[PDB]
Amino acid sequence: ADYTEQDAMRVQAVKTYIDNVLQEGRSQIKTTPLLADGINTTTRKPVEWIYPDGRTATISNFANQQNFLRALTAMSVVTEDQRYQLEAVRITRYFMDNFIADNGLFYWGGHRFVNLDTLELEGPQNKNSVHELKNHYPYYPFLYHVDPHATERYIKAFWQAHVEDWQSLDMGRHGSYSKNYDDKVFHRPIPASLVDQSKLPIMPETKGLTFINAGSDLIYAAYQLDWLAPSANAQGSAAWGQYLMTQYKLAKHPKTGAPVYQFTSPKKREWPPQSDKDTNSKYGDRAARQFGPELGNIAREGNVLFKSNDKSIVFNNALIELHLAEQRNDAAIREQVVDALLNFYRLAYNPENGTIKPIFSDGTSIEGIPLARDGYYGPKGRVFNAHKPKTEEYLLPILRAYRLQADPELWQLAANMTHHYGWGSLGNDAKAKPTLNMQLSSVSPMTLFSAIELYQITQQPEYLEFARAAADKLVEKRFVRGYFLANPRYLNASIDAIEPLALLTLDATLKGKTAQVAPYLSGSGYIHGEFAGKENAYDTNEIYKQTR
Amino acid sequence: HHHHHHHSSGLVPRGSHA
Ligand SMILES: [Mn+2]
Numbered sequence A: 001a002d003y004t005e006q007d008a009m010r011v012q013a014v015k016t017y018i019d020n021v022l023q024e025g026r027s028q029i030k031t032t033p034l035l036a037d038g039i040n041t042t043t044r045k046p047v048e049w050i051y052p053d054g055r056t057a058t059i060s061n062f063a064n065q066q067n068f069l070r071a072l073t074a075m076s077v078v079t080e081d082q083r084y085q086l087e088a089v090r091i092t093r094y095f096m097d098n099f100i101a102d103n104g105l106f107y108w109g110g111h112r113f114v115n116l117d118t119l120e121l122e123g124p125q126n127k128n129s130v131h132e133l134k135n136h137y138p139y140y141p142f143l144y145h146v147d148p149h150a151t152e153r154y155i156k157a158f159w160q161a162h163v164e165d166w167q168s169l170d171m172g173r174h175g176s177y178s179k180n181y182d183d184k185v186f187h188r189p190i191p192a193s194l195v196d197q198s199k200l201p202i203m204p205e206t207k208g209l210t211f212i213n214a215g216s217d218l219i220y221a222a223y224q225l226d227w228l229a230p231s232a233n234a235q236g237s238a239a240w241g242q243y244l245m246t247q248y249k250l251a252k253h254p255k256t257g258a259p260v261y262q263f264t265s266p267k268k269r270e271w272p273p274q275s276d277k278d279t280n281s282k283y284g285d286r287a288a289r290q291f292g293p294e295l296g297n298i299a300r301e302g303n304v305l306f307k308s309n310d311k312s313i314v315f316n317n318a319l320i321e322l323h324l325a326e327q328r329n330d331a332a333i334r335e336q337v338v339d340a341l342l343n344f345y346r347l348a349y350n351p352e353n354g355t356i357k358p359i360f361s362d363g364t365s366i367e368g369i370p371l372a373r374d375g376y377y378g379p380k381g382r383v384f385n386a387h388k389p390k391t392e393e394y395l396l397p398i399l400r401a402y403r404l405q406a407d408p409e410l411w412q413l414a415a416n417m418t419h420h421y422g423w424g425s426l427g428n429d430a431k432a433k434p435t436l437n438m439q440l441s442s443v444s445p446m447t448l449f450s451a452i453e454l455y456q457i458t459q460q461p462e463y464l465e466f467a468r469a470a471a472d473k474l475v476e477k478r479f480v481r482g483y484f485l486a487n488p489r490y491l492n493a494s495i496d497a498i499e500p501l502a503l504l505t506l507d508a509t510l511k512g513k514t515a516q517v518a519p520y521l522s523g524s525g526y527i528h529g530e531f532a533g534k535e536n537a538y539d540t541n542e543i544y545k546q547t548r
Numbered sequence B: 001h002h003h004h005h006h007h008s009s010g011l012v013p014r015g016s017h018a
Helices: A005-024 A066-079 A083-098 A140-146 A148-162 A212-228 A237-250 A286-298 A309-328 A331-348 A395-404 A408-420 A445-458 A462-478 A499-510
Strands: A038-040 A048-050 A056-060 A113-115 A492-494 A528-531 A534-538
Touching (some): A005 A038, A005 A499, A048 A528, A066 A499, A309 A395
Antiparallel strands (some): A038 A492
């Protein structure tokens, strides 16, 4: 590309943000390489967890900063200036030198973080100081670069602490910092599948702890161990990643091929529940409780594709599986992803308006129907409407899949989605020259990642014109008081914002370096515990949605 | 634990939620 002052000014927004984070996100009380998770944009101070007793702790949670690591390494790629990547190394090396448990687990995640001012460990949730991830997708290749031994031990410790049962693959969410490390964790032999295909859509009963928003990080980690580490150190890891990934595929709906959210249901192990609102899985499968009376055998938890279950399948885990297919040059991973996306959208997508219907994996829709009773999926009277996400999240996997396997039905779905997002016309196939909307005013980071994929696909410079105009609007709307904010009324900025990565990926593409930047994988973080007066609280709301 | 909670999809209250 012929580069312009406007392109440079977007890189300078990102450089300003980085400078702000590295300054304002450092404690004045005790200065170390650690970073704050978030910055108050009025005071310029790092954000705080407030405990019920009123004590405050400044938050440093390395699980919520992986996207900032990716922006630092991206900035060194696009600028050819090594100082950004070197500062990412400095932060990372200090964290890994100091804040790993004896068993190899990091002190980070949903229920653990480091006090930025005192360097003490913090447990936002009383009596639950545990290791918790949930579609976090850490920046493994860079962590491996900084400290390969600690990164190998981490992945082995993550599997060892969260896999409760090596035959059912029940996965606990709350990993113990007292669990013993086992260097030979992946040397266990691969067991048979529990999935009996002639019984689907009914699935095997175990503890039912096989949700894809637990399985996906485990699969990702095992495959990155295989990819990154020597043979001997990584023995067994790709096989165990493959087994776990395959269990989801084996449990797909036997008539529609639609993907599922999990591959086992919870046994009814205790009785009685206190009421319909008591949704502990020990009372049995929650979908069968809430929907079973009207819907029958389809009503089991893995077959529910609404209430954001579809997002974890067709967005988060789809991006991971596509990334692994491409990394490993693995056509079987690829065809299975493509088949899953196609079979989901044939049942759920409405091409007249671009919406996604709330469905079960056999195609039964509950669109518009008030829930008949309370339960895990909502109170009685809740209504699920067909949804069209605010931004092009669901588009990105369809474009990445197309770039790997040119299926014309993926192309038709992407053209229809972009049409309803206001992009204009991609045209009838990937050889068309598109007619794109250069005044599109609702833009997001997903606009830029998607436009870049379509440029890599089609080589049509129109997509770069479109992305440049969108990126200028993105900076104009979200770069506010020196940080990136989803709404200019918000008080507190998270340093895990993805606008910087999206902006730098576009800059890389203008400089012919796209392949060199960390790919966006949809990982994100949160902290959950008791916040001031509120028992069941997330930083997402208690901090990052506060208004100035 | 000791305050029991789920980890369902859609539970963490992102700004993207309707
Ligand atoms: Mn938890």
